Symmetry: D2
């Protein structure tokens, strides 16, 4: 049996309600030890070692946790055959993409969560954990980048996102589809992500204890410029725009971000629309404003890649080339 | 013997052009309503069409003043026509549609339409979209359904309709509760109507209003700044909508700022950046303890529309939560 | 607390394998009392009684069980406040539509199953059954036709279909959307079906012991006319065509069906395409041939309505009017 | 300095038309490949296009003869051109695409295209679909991805592509594993390629083949007749595909007819009427005991293509299962 390390961070998968009958819950109260021997069947497919990194709801995920995870994985790579990270669902898709760019281990790294409390009727977390361990154990999972395993599906860390606030089936790679499906402890892989990931990216966080400051502003009818201005006034390194339609900006936001970009703030146009690329060549002259188009990266994904691009360059053309390769 | 249909034009890519039929480049102010209407001569087989230019903007620059002008016009002119079609940019068409759905007192058909391809592009979607919009507005079965959006041969209620994709001609969907009807051969089979209260069944009356309460939206993500939320509180915003993570959760620092603002009277609505599903009561956030409101299926930009209108009526969070359960 | 009757028919919800972590299972050997006390929380929301009607896999569902179920619901309507029917997934969409057309009882009738057997890790059956009893107990559920409740969702019996072979979230109302979502035992209903159902249909099976014979033929490139001919030779009352695209037929199948319709066989054009109407006024002049256009009914749903239509009329124009109203 | 691109025309609504732009009615494959081309002058900006008419039929009448003809012509003319577009009806485009995906030995781009609206209708999709199909066939990056379908600005692999909606312009989706890339402003960002073996990586050779093994499809449902199954068996079909219920299950009487056929030599594949997901092994059916093959993600019309070609190599059920695990 392969050795698999579980790195725990908290989440609904470690968290419970007063009741199985009721929807209410508190996040990340169970330790990884307790999580693992609640699924005795993991012992049939791996030798599982648990380590607790942090124990938070993922709605409070942060750069320090990210840097701890990436360095822990890169250091401990030769000690184990694969990793599974137990994590809250709310921001699993951001951590997954961060790790997808910063992990240099080409062994399987699999993230997993639960949409129901571990005390709830028909709790999803047990079988999710089991399938995550199946994926991390499968020799075919290597060299695919950092993965998310939810609802019997293996999803790439770059495309995966949430489709629904509560559904057990919420995690989907909404633009390019999944990599494979898990049935009876076996995976039929038919896809791998063509974007460069893991050991094929320049991003190296081994000596970083903080990341560039990147905030996200929303566009909508009558949008205030005050959020954008607040990030500019604090000296943020970059701003991501959650654009309306194909990455478009409300006029007051457009003005503020055009000004910021002139003074060297990196600006990435993404979209609040859940699927499709924010393209070049549409209504915005990105060349002229010094903006970057996010492509299929949603706002929170574009934040991950922009924070990391800014560790290598402040140059908008070079950042755009980063957004075309990773 | 054909219905009288008014077109209220606001601009949008439907009225927009670039220099090549086969390059994506375009701008939005290009074609007036007269020229828009005359380019689809098949309209005169189904309706007597009159066109009025209300504004001419990209809907990325839609704003409270345009909403108020459109509601008051539709309400004032209800008796002069059999139905209304509004040409509009796609980017914020879902927000305008919900604003009209809550403030229009006319129960004749109001249908919104736009185009995901410019008028000059090969296989331009705007002509057939506008034709189907006029079909919808002329169908007496369209009445009493609220304000509608018609795109890609589908009839969508103004509450649930939203964009699913940045560029796809099929992007407009009612992602939580489905469409009202599909259009085939100029006929509609309706199998649904929205249960939530709309148009003449709301208390929202903008007839005397010249501005709306100030509501901002803040995004949640890992390591989110509280600076956007703090800037809105410092500017005296009447309400703030949180685009939460998962089931409407907030990053700790955002949470701390909004819990403080709610104590001082700021209306706070928790919604979700996740494109489908309710932001529910009775999950991780004790809304009754902080004075917060859960948005239900209303996404952040929709939640903004209803909160602005709620704040014309009340400042009490229990009353705003009741509005969010009924409209 | 309301009185809820569980009419059990078998299915995966009552199905079991040899391991929590192997996909193998069988149906048809586990009784309703086992399901009811796998969900002790039911006692918090209802006074439940279980009756075993049959114990089958729904792949073997048939006209006799349909007739049994409609009669029993219609007969026992006064004895309870609502019904839940436990049922296999595979043909749940057929039974739900039959009962939507034939039940005259004014109380909630809710169907439920499970995509994982009762023995699996993270079995979906217990919370589905709890949510189905919440649904049947909800006064707001009345007057909405026969319902299916799967994965925290209330689906109408006409539109509901399977979208995926294995996904717990497979059940969707793919053309018109769900009626309501369930969270913390509460439903927010925002829709009701416009098509006529239950006590508003002329279908009455109270004394029928069989149903007219209606079979389904599939269309594809180089399709054999031998399936269609085998139904015609056997004197079938009706044939449903799973059409290509918008209800189209391969030349040989069309010829066999145009002939059958001239002898008085009823022919409904439906589509193998899983969403969208088979329309009138496309490539097939239905009036010229004596054919009926299924609208949004998929082939197996079209068979349900065609069987019931033939209990009243053999007339093509009258059958089309039934396909326009139910 | 432009690629040479060959258009092979087969008919389909992308060629012919209704009496009207306003009305839904139409007749299929009445325009020659030549109308098609001249109808899109911008093709000359991106390629040197030459058209040949192979057949001129509605794709609801696609057949084994057209498949053989197409595969042989593409394998013959591979050396003469830089890539192929095939204009085809929508209705069975997904079966011809998998067929060519398994039989074409040319690793130059082969892209299939159609139109969900008649050539004569308002906002016809056929022109820009054809532009995009030519863009795909011209893009050096499209080589070695197997046979493609290009519809609604999306590049789809031949194996997974299928119809999702009877009439929507956006009906074509790779419903299990997603598209290979999206087309904007005439450029494609490929992020995927299919891992299943195709074109020159398959043993299927139709070059000397004037017919295919007989494979029929049977439908399952509540109270399913065994008479369709019995009929194909009586006619000594080489293969039967079951469109099963749920995860490839069969009605008792169909099960028993197909069990009996498999024990005497007939190749039996369980597929599913359910539009997504695999028909798996190790569910309710002991496939090894009955001599059945599980179709995986192949829907019944797709499973028929693969079973016919497998039967040109082998009759052995464990060998057909190996082909169903590999292509």
């Amino acid at each position: 049996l392969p050795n698999i390390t579980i790195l725990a961070t908290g989440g609904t998968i470690a968290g419970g309600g007063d009741s199985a009958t009721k929807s209410n819950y508190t996040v990340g109260k169970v330790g990884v030890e307790n999580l693992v021997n609640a699924v005795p069947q993991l012992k049939d497919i791996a030798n599982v070692k648990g380590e607790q990194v942090v124990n938070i709801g993922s709605q409070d995920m942060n750069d320090n946790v990210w840097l701890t995870l990436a360095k822990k994985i890169n250091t401990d790579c030769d000690k184990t055959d694969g990793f599974v990270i137990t994590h809250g669902t709310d921001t699993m898709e951001e951590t997954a993409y961060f790790l997808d760019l910063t992990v240099k281990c080409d062994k399987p790294v699999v993230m997993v969560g639960a949409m129901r409390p571990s005390t709830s009727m028909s709790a999803d977390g047990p079988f999710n954990l089991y399938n995550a361990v199946v994926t991390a154990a499968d020799k075919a999972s290597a060299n695919r980048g950092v993965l998310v395993v939810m609802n019997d599906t293996v999803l790439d860390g770059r495309d995966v996102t949430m489709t629904n606030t509560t559904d057990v089936a919420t995690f989907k790679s909404v633009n390019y589809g999944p990599l494979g499906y898990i049935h009876n402890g076996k995976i039929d892989y038919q896809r791998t992500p063509a974007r460069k990931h893991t050991s094929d990216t320049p991003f190296d966080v081994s000596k970083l204890n903080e990341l560039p400051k990147v905030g996200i502003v929303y566009n909508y009818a009558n949008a205030s410029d005050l959020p954008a201005k607040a990030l500019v006034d604090a000296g943020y390194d970059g701003i991501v725009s959650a654009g309306v339609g194909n990455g478009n900006l409300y006029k007051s936001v457009f003005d503020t971000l055009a000004t910021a970009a002139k003074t060297g703030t990196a600006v990435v146009r993404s979209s609040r629309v859940p699927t499709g690329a924010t393209t070049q060549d549409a209504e915005v002259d990105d060349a002229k404003y010094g903006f970057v188009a996010s492509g299929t990266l949603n706002p929170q994904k574009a934040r991950v890649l922009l924070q990391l691009a800014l560790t290598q360059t402040k140059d908008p053309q070079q950042i755009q080339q980063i957004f075309n390769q990773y």
